[PDB]
Structures are given as structure tokens and as C-alpha cells.
Design a binder for this molecule. Structure first.
Ligand SMILES: Cc1cc2nc3c(=O)[nH]c(=O)nc-3n(C[C@H](O)[C@H](O)[C@H](O)COP(=O)(O)OP(=O)(O)OC[C@H]3O[C@@H](n4cnc5c(N)ncnc54)[C@H](O)[C@@H]3O)c2cc1C
Ligand SMILES: Cc1cc2nc3c(=O)[nH]c(=O)nc-3n(C[C@H](O)[C@H](O)[C@H](O)COP(=O)(O)OP(=O)(O)OC[C@H]3O[C@@H](n4cnc5c(N)ncnc54)[C@H](O)[C@@H]3O)c2cc1C
Ligand SMILES: [Cl-]
Ligand SMILES: [Cl-]
Lengths: 539, 528
């Protein structure tokens, strides 16, 4: 009679979980206040999300999830309406000034982690919702949750329409408005998080490529276009994203995702301005951004937020789980959101199914999911807070950037090797061993990385508290980078004067040779391979 | 400052018009109570909408509109999420019986009118909205219109949010909930319309091809698959549509639009059943349909309507126009809605731009728009009412089917020829001349067609009233078909025994030969 699981929120987190549970013969109800199709933000993918999507798909036997793990599979299976992401781009702007071409950074994503996308979320979320319903999930859309009641036998969810849903377990896969977080008072008030930012964002038609509106010397031009990736316009205590859906030949979607993050402590609310007027007031500060957006028109009602950050004291209890985005949020910066979502679905799914099967809901079974959830948010907090502090001074940012981007290659390889070894042998142990790491939520959980990132964090926070200058901090971190032995030297991560990291087959072969003889066992374990093996992997 | 035009409704009708006006430099506001993306019904295209989309695009210089006129251009420019429509398929079903393979119709759409599509309307409507804004239309979404107030100088639209919009002209491009039709008391109550039907519809995943679930003898299989077009499951005083979006290799959209039309005088309201329950209670009547939909699951909240038909006493005034779907509606049958929409945009757009330029809003300039609006509805009403009556007797439907479909090529080539003339001469003259026909709103407005359709209508209504037998009507109409000289003989339209009309290159060439030396001037003018 009762549902096994009621999932509140029919976005990607809810429908990926619902697809896994429904495919394995469980009885699922998806509840959402909205109806597909609908706009959702969280558009840019990273290497980690790609490999973890593939990992979830293989581990739980849901092919539809692996179709989100590459630009090619999204186009072929979801819709034509998505953009490519070959790179992360960063460009510093000062008020009334042209951008300095020596204050840019680019990370071109290596082929081995896969081909990143700009997700048009209305289509990815419709796609996974249709998959969830096809696997046997029941759904109620335009369904507002008013009340959640727990007893010894399960949970009762009451709608505004006067109806009730009875289930054995509740997953809240909503956002800030999480009905469960409100019902149980799970929100930390005030929030423990150090990062401060509010947002203004929309979708625009007629956004130009930044590549066509900057006066850059031929030799300082990036190896791949800015417009082929996620462009980050950096300024004092804020940044603006430019995420085109039309940045490839014969792209059907003419839209561009556009938003600004502002630290609300340094940029106070302007309720006298409309969202759009406040957006353009920031555009008009930066001549090159003004030229890029000159013909850009909003095709949506603007979103303008207060401080966006939130955190929870508890994310799992008896017969309930708070999914990543319902538990906490930092910032769009670095697109950690969808990675965190995938880490939690991987860890939760087999634990929840074992609990449902045994009919045992002891919170002890979900202890790792709590630890991972809080760890992801706290590590994500430091990375973004460190970046926002560094935006005041490029030589400081320059260290943040290569420490972040180096870990993205080492971290991705770690998850890809585990997945590869699990497919070769059929032994799930290689994937389960990922959970046995000392730093749950850290994207590259190795002692030498933890130590480098702790020192980065200590110095950035010192700059923010006024204990040290951005210059002082930049000098110390630049020397540490220059003294490093682990920062993938063939790719240029250990060279502060290399601003555009451009992986090529030749450099990836050299990394494998460099790794073979390395004194660090983790470098050998993750990166060591013959020339022939690296070519075999790139086929 | 003031807008030139405020358009209420950001569906295709509103954004195609806003795109036209904004491209010609007029200042446009689009208001809508919803936000893109959003589901809309009206998914199947016909020859007439394709050729009139091409006409609008070429005549008003908006290329985006022409990308709706071809399955290939829809996939290349809108999104991958649309299906193909190679044909109209018709299958008769009786309660508890297998479909009779001698009680089916197919009209395969000829190359000349173009490649029809199954529109995933969330994507077409998003595309035209994006085009309209790019041309320079302003827009407010989640905007609920509370009051519309005209004066000598223009109109004021008041919003729930306490804001107002000032413009010189208002177009209502919404639907049945038209605020202009409501606030001005424009609705005919009761409606003058003869057709009666209510609807239940949704989008489903896991709908199979009917081709794979019927035991048809090889020699009675259609030239092209049923699943490659819009299938109509016909029964006593009702029909069901299957409009797949996945009916082509490497289709990205797995959904299928499914809906049932019921004459509510013959099938009274079942408020004891959920919409889904009432839908399945009709599926369970017909074993073949039941097998097709066996694994099908809905991905939307179901829509269930009361009687869907509505009409208006007036569709134009001083500084306002009621756009086709805001003015009236008959039925999804034969997909006339988007044709009606395109015809009105073609007739309205040049007159309106002339009025804005001259700052003269005398309603007499818009008299033809009114005549076309009411004419489309009246002719559409007869087409569908005649069809619903004929569903009781296949031999009678067989006559309705060929009289309707024979008009596709003839009415199609009429609009093509006018478009070709205007392209070569560069004179809008030859498109304006389409407004000078003697039967505004009739899809083939020639005396010999008007007379043939008039007789079909008189016989069908006499069957409905019980004055003439369905059998009597079928024999008289079968005789008129067999004795006709105009019903494109080479395609089999004049042959009641030809159920599957399959226009090939060989047959279309023969049509051209036969036309060249025809006694009727219209046949020569159109098909030679
Ligand atoms: C401005 C912004 C930018 C971001 N950018 C990125 C990025 O670039 N990359 C990235 O990886 N991540 C990004 N993120 C994070 C990203 O949004 C999430 O990680 C991702 O969308 C996960 O979505 P979800 O399925 O968990 O939930 P969502 O997609 O947020 O689903 C929320 C659902 O909750 C429902 N709901 C709410 N209240 C109720 C109720 N009472 N009853 C019923 N239903 C209810 C709503 O109807 C809605 O459908 C961004 C986030 C924000 C806010
Ligand atoms: C069940 C059904 C099936 C149909 N099937 C077909 C078919 O197969 N083929 C075909 O050619 N035609 C079909 N039609 C007809 C077709 O739907 C219309 O001709 C077509 O949608 C016209 O488009 P539009 O832009 O005028 O209106 P719509 O598509 O109805 O869009 C109207 C817009 O106005 C907005 N709006 C509505 N009310 C208000 C308000 N009060 N205030 C503000 N905004 C408002 C809506 O949010 C929406 O965005 C069908 C119609 C129905 C009802
Ligand atoms: Cl994020
Ligand atoms: Cl219609």
C-alpha cells in the first residue's frame, strides 16, 4: 500500500535517484510544486561530474545517466539545445579599464575525463524525468507540500489540495525552500559558511563571443576560444558567468546563460533598481563586457536573490535524507553543485536500497552520507571563499587557479581508474574503495594536496581578516608552487607564467612517463603508464 | 513612451506577429500569464500551414517563420525534439473488435506542399519567442492582465502587479481564456457552432507503433507506415490522436501526444472517473488501441475539458484585433488551428502596419479580417461536424475523406502560385489578391468545390437529423465522386475503392498532363 520512497523535487537529483530506485523494483512517488518543462540553473559540467555520472550509470545499471556524461551523448540522446565546454576561462576587469591580457587564465579540459557540456537544464531535467516515469516512478506535478509527519512505520506528506502520500522513507531533493529543512528546523541560522554572494541571472539572446570584443596581442590569445567554454569575468568581490548554448557549428539553441555573483557585504542591495537595471549598472563598469553584451536581450523574468549560501546541522535522520542541494549551497563558481549531487547519489543509493530491503532505518547506516554531505559543502566553501578573496589581486588568484585545476586532473583520474578497474574485473571493490579516504568531500583527497590547500586557505583567510597583504600572500604561495614536485609540470601547473593550461596527447604521454619514476606513491598509482597505454586510453 | 502594439499571448500566433512588426521597426510589448518553456497543444502541421508559413516569411521578410515550414528546417533550426508527418492515417474501430483493414484511410502529403512535422510546441513557441525578442519586442511573462481600457489615443493594459502598459493597438493572441473576449463581452453565448466535442489529452512515454499491433493482410498495408504520420483512431461520435515525436531514426524525443475527442451529447461527463480513468475506459473498448498503448505512461498532469467549441460576435474593433484561437475553436481534427492562425497573421499584418503608419484605425480597413475570421470558423465547423456524423458509417466517411484531401493539392498550389508570382514580379499585388476570393475561410475557394462541399454538408446534416439514411447519403456522394471531372483522377481521389492516396512523382506528372487540357479554367490555372 505505502510507497517505498517519496522524493520531493523532480530536478536532476530527484529523477536520477528515482530512476535508480524504480529500476531496482522499488515503489517511488516524485512530488514537485512545478511542472516540466521548466528552467533550472546549474548549467556547466566539470571532469568530476562526467566520470561520476559514468560511475553511477555502470554501478546501478541506468544507461540514461551515462548519456549526460559527454557533449556527444547529450546531443544524441537528450536534445540539440546544449552548448560545448572545452575550457574554463577567467578574465580580470577593473572599473573603466580595458582588461589586461596578462591577467587571464584558461584550463582546457583534458580528453581523458571526457567532453564537458553547457546543459540546457529544461531538456536534461525533462529527459531524466521521462526516464524515471518510464522505469515506473509515479509523479504528481504542480503539487505543493504543506506538511511532513514521521511515525514508527513511515512518513505522511500532505498537499495543499488536501491529499496525502504515505511512504517508508522521504528524500528531499528541493533547494533553499526544502519543506523538510523547514519542518525539522535543519537550517543553521546563522549559516557556518564563510562565502558571501548574492546573484542576478537570466538567459539572453544576441550575446557575442568575448574573443571578438577584446584587443589581445596575437601571442597572449588563448589556444582555444573563450566562447567555446565557461567564461568568468572577474572583478573586486564578484564575477559574471557567460555560458553559451550556441558555441558550436549548427547549434540550434541561440540562448546564452548570464549571471553576476556579488559579495553583498561590499555590494549592498539596490531595491530602487529593477534586477535588469542593477545587472546593466555592473556591465557598464567594464568596457570589454559592455561591448560583448551590447546587443544582448533577456528572454526570461530576471532572478535577483539575497545572500544565496545556506547549510544544515543534519542531512540524514530516521526515514529521511536531505539531498546535496537541499542540504547546502556555496556558489555557481567552479560548477561543484552537480558534482556534489552525483557524489551523494553514488553513496546514498545502495545504502538506501539495503535499508529498504532489510526494513532497518538506523541512522548509523547513513553515517558516511552525513560525513560526505558536510565535507563537500565545507571544502566547496573554502575553494569559493579563497577565490573571491583572490579576485582583488591576479598574482594571488594565479596560485588559487593552478592548485584548483591541477587537483581536477588528479582527482578525475582517481575516479576513472577505479571505474576502469571495476569494468575490467567486475569487482565493485575498486569503486567502494573511493569511500575509504581520510578527507570526505575533498575533490583530490591526498595528504600532499590537503596540505597545499590548507596553506592556500590559511593565507587567503589571513588576507580577508587583514593579517597579511594580497601581495605578501601571493609571494608565499608562488614560491610553494615553484618548490612543488607534484603539479603535473608537462601541463604547466607548476609554472606561474603559464596562464593557459593546454593539455595535448604529447603532454599527457609525458605526464605518464614523469609519473612512472615519481617518489610519491599516489602520483605513481594515479598517473604512471607506458606511452602505449596512454595512446590506448585516448582511442 | 507608448508601444505601437501590445500583444497578449506569447504562443506562436503572438510571437510570429510580434516578430513581423518588430522587424518592420514597430515598438512591441508581448504579455503572457505563463513563462517559456511551456506545453501547448496543436502539434500536427498540414500542407496549407506549410505554404502559408513560407508566404508570411517571404512576404514580411522574417526567415525564422519559414524554418517552421519543413520537418528538415525544424530539426536544423528549432530543436531535434520534433517528429515527422508523412501522412494522415485513419483507422475505424468498433467496441470489442479488431480493426477492419478495409475501413482505413491514408492521405500521404505530396512533396509539392512540403514536409509536414509533429511540433513539440514548447520548442517551436520558445524559438519564435526568442526570435521576437531578438527583433526588439519587449516581454513580460508571469504577467496576469486585470483590465484593458481603450480611449481616442490608444489602450492601457493593467497588471495584477499594479503596473500598466500603454500602446496604440492591442492584439489578443491568447486562447479560450482571452481577457479581451471576456472583458468586452465578445463571446457568442450560446455559440452558433454545430460541432460538439470535449477532450482528454496528455504526453506519454512508451507508446508503440500501431503498425506492429495490427494483423493487417500484406496487400492492405499502407504505402507508408501509420506511425510516420498522425494516426486518427475513429469510433462512434469520437476519435483519438497518436502524434509521436520519436517516429524517425535517432529521434531524441521519446514522447507521444495522445488525446480523445468525445461528442458530449453521446458521451456525458464522468466526474466519478479521473481524467486518466476516463481516457483508459475508452482505450479498453478497442483491442488494437489497447495493445498500442499497453506500456504507455503519462508524463504530464492530464487535461480534461468541457465542450471545447467557442465563437465570437466581433473579432476586430477600433485599435484591437481578436487573433484566430482567441476568437473561436472547433476541434483538433485535420489540424486547421495553425492554418487558421497563419491565414489571419497574413491578412492582419500589412493592414495593421498601414494603420500604424497612417495613424488611422478606422475598423473599415479591417473588415476583411473579420470576414476571414468568421469564415474560417464556419467552414471548419462544417468540415468537423460532417466528419463526426460520418464516423458511424465508413462508406460515408470515405466521401468526406476524399472531398477534404483533394482540396490539399488544389488549395495548396493556389497559395504557392501567388507566392511564386510575388517573388518574380516583386509585387505584393499577387498575395493581396488571395483576399479577393468569393468564400473567405474555405481552404479551396472555387465554385465547383464550394458546391461539392455544400452538398456533402446538406446530406451529413440530414443524416444527423435522421431525415436521410447514412446509407442513402453514402450512395449519392459515391455517385457524385465517380461522375466528377475535378477530383485529381491520377491520385485516385475520384475512386472510392482507393483508400490509400499515395502521390508519387510519376502521378504528379500525370496530374500536370490531365490539367493542361481541362475544360475548367481553374484546373488549367492551378495544376498545368
Ligand atoms: C544561481 C545558481 C547557479 C548555479 N550554477 C551551477 C553551475 O554552473 N554548475 C553546477 O554544477 N551547479 C550549479 N548550481 C547548483 C545547481 O543548482 C544544483 O547542484 C543542481 O541544480 C541540482 O538540482 P536538484 O535536482 O538537486 O534541484 P532543483 O533543480 O533545484 O529542484 C528544486 C525543485 O524543488 C521543488 N520544490 C521546492 N519547494 C517545494 C515544495 N514545498 N513542494 C514541492 N516541490 C517543491 C521545486 O518545484 C523545484 O522543482 C547553481 C545554483 C544556483 C542557485
Ligand atoms: C486539444 C487541442 C488540440 C489541437 N490540435 C491541433 C492540431 O493538431 N493542429 C493544429 O494546427 N491546431 C491544433 N489546435 C489548435 C491550436 O492549439 C491553435 O490554433 C494554436 O495553438 C494557436 O496558437 P496561439 O499562439 O494563438 O495560442 P496558444 O498556443 O494557446 O498560446 C496562447 C498563449 O497565451 C497565453 N495566455 C492565455 N491566456 C492568457 C491570459 N489570460 N493572459 C495572458 N496570457 C494568456 C498562454 O500562456 C500562451 O502562452 C488544437 C487545439 C486544442 C485545444
Ligand atoms: Cl555549484
Ligand atoms: Cl485544429
Amino acid at each position: 500500500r505505502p510507497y517505498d520512497v517519496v522524493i520531493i523535487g523532480s530536478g536532476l537529483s530527484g529523477t536520477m535517484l528515482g530512476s535508480i530506485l524504480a529500476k531496482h523494483g522499488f515503489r517511488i512517488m516524485l512530488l514537485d510544486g512545478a511542472h516540466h518543462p521548466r528552467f533550472a540553473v546549474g548549467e556547466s559540467t566539470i571532469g568530476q561530474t562526467l566520470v561520476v555520472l559514468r560511475l553511477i550509470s555502470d554501478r546501478y545499471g541506468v544507461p540514461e545517466i551515462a548519456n549526460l556524461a559527454s557533449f556527444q551523448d547529450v546531443l544524441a540522446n537528450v536534445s540539440s539545445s546544449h552548448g560545448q565546454k572545452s575550457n574554463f576561462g577567467f578574465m580580470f576587469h577593473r572599473d573603466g579599464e580595458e582588461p589586461d591580457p596578462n591577467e587571464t587564465s584558461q584550463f582546457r579540459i583534458p580528453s581523458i575525463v571526457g567532453n564537458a557540456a553547457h546543459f540546457f537544464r529544461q531538456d536534461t531535467d525533462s529527459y531524466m524525468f521521462h526516464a524515471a516515469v518510464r522505469y515506473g516512478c509515479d509523479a504528481r506535478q504542480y503539487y505543493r507540500v504543506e506538511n511532513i509527519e514521521f511515525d514508527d512505520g513511515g512518513v505522511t506528506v500532505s498537499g495543499a489540495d488536501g491529499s496525502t502520500v504515505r511512504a517508508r522513507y522521504l528524500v528531499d531533493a528541493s533547494g533553499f525552500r526544502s519543506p523538510l529543512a523547514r519542518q525539522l528546523g535543519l537550517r543553521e541560522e546563522p549559516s557556518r559558511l564563510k562565502h558571501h554572494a548574492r546573484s542576478i541571472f537570466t538567459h539572453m539572446v544576441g550575446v557575442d563571443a568575448i574573443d571578438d570584443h577584446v584587443d589581445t596581442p596575437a601571442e597572449l590569445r588563448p589556444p582555444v576560444p573563450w566562447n567555446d567554454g565557461t567564461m568568468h569575468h572577474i572583478f573586486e568581490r564578484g564575477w559574471m558567468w557567460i555560458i553559451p548554448f550556441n558555441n558550436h557549428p549548427g547549434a540550434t539553441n541561440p540562448l546564452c546563460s548570464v549571471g553576476i555573483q556579488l559579495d553583498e557585504r561590499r555590494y549592498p542591495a539596490r531595491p530602487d533598481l529593477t534586477p535588469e537595471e542593477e545587472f546593466w549598472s555592473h556591465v557598464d563598469r567594464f568596457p570589454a563586457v559592455q561591448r560583448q553584451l551590447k546587443g544582448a536581450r533577456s528572454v526570461r523574468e530576471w532572478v535577483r536573490t539575497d545572500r544565496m549560501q545556506y547549510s544544515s546541522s543534519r542531512t540524514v535522520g530516521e526515514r529521511w535524507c536531505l539531498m546535496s542541494h537541499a542540504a547546502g549551497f556555496i556558489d555557481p563558481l567552479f560548477s561543484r553543485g552537480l558534482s556534489n549531487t552525483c557524489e551523494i547519489i553514488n553513496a546514498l543509493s545502495w545504502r538506501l536500497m539495503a535499508a529498504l530491503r532489510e526494513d532497518d532505518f538506523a541512522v548509523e547506516r547513513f553515517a558516511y552520507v552525513e560525513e560526505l554531505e558536510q565535507g563537500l559543502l565545507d571544502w566547496n566553501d573554502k575553494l569559493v571563499n579563497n577565490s573571491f578573496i583572490s579576485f582583488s589581486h591576479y598574482p594571488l588568484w594565479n596560485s588559487v587557479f593552478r592548485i584548483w585545476a591541477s587537483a581536477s586532473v588528479i582527482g578525475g583520474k582517481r575516479i576513472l581508474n577505479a571505474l576502469t578497474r571495476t569494468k575490467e574485473t567486475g569487482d565493485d571493490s575498486h569503486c567502494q574503495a573511493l569511500d575509504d579516504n581520510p578527507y570526505p568531500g575533498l575533490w583530490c583527497p591526498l595528504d600532499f594536496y590537503k596540505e597545499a590547500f590548507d596553506e592556500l586557505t590559511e593565507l587567503c583567510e589571513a588576507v580577508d581578516a587583514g593579517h597579511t597583504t594580497a601581495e605578501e600572500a601571493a609571494r608565499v604561495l608562488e614560491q610553494r608552487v615553484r618548490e612543488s614536485d607534484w603539479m603535473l609540470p608537462a601541463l604547466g601547473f607548476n609554472d606561474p607564467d603559464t596562464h593557459h593550461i593546454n593539455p595535448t596527447a604529447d603532454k599527457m604521454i609525458r605526464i605518464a612517463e614523469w609519473a612512472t619514476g615519481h617518489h610519491r606513491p599516489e602520483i605513481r598509482e594515479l598517473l604512471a603508464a607506458s606511452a602505449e597505454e596512454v595512446r590506448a586510453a585516448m582511442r
